[PDB]
């Protein structure tokens, strides 16, 4: 799709110019050097001043041919312990839905930043992962403990 690819080229150019510190977002390069902008390997740094700090969490971002009218799908690889990430790694987030808060004007920067913020402040209106969710609500201590062990597991070493 010319429309999707022309926008993803703009996205990639802007990312290269300037993006938020610690964030990674690299379209997939084919064995032959040519580009697949429909599949991006990303990383989210855990937010500073929070139990997430220090973790660098890989997420894949997949675009469909009706991008930017459609959102990407955003998948943590591996899946993370967090109330709003399904056991699959797929992120439940309203800006990732046409029928909720996705609009064409949302950029990859805002997507990644949106998800970094979600990591830190869960939406209790969406239990995507019932055990992370139940612990978040009923045992914040155990929740914070698991969050710090997970940040530690995914800290660059």
């Amino acid at each position: 799709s010319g429309i999707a690819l022309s926008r993803l080229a703009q996205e990639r150019k802007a990312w290269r110019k300037d993006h938020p510190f610690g964030f990674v977002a690299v379209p997939t390069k084919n064995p032959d050097g040519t580009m697949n902008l429909m599949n991006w390997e990303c990383a989210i740094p855990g937010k500073k001043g929070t139990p997430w700090e220090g973790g660098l969490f890989k997420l894949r971002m997949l675009f469909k041919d009706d991008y930017p009218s459609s959102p990407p799908k955003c998948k943590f690889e591996p899946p993370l312990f967090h109330p709003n990430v399904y056991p699959s790694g797929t992120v439940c987030l309203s800006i990732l839905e046409e029928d909720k808060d996705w609009r064409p004007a949302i950029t990859i920067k805002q997507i990644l930043l949106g998800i970094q913020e979600l990591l830190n402040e869960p939406n209790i209106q969406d239990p995507a992962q019932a055990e992370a969710y139940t612990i978040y609500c009923q045992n914040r201590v155990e929740y914070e403990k698991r969050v710090r062990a997970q940040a530690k597991k995914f800290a660059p070493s």
Partner: protein, 79 residues
């Protein structure tokens, strides 16, 4: 011619090959090449015999033939 094979070569010696009608505006070829490189349309320039290829140039106009080479460069260079 009816279709001619055009070769697009960059600085790295990589080639991508297009089958195009002589009649068709070379914008489509440019558009595809940029797509394969993952860069905007306005960021690359394409030259044949040292002259810039316009969007509405056709292989017929510029006198192109089977296996002719188009050299591609970064604008500026930038981009």
């Amino acid at each position: 011619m009816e279709y001619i094979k055009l070769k697009v070569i960059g600085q790295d010696s990589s080639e991508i090959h297009f089958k195009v009608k002589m009649t068709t505006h070379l914008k489509k070829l440019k558009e595809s090449y940029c797509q394969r490189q993952g860069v905007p349309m306005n960021s690359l320039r394409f030259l044949f015999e040292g002259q810039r290829i316009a969007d509405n140039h056709t292989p017929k106009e510029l006198g192109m033939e089977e296996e002719d080479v188009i050299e591609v460069y970064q604008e500026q260079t930038g981009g």
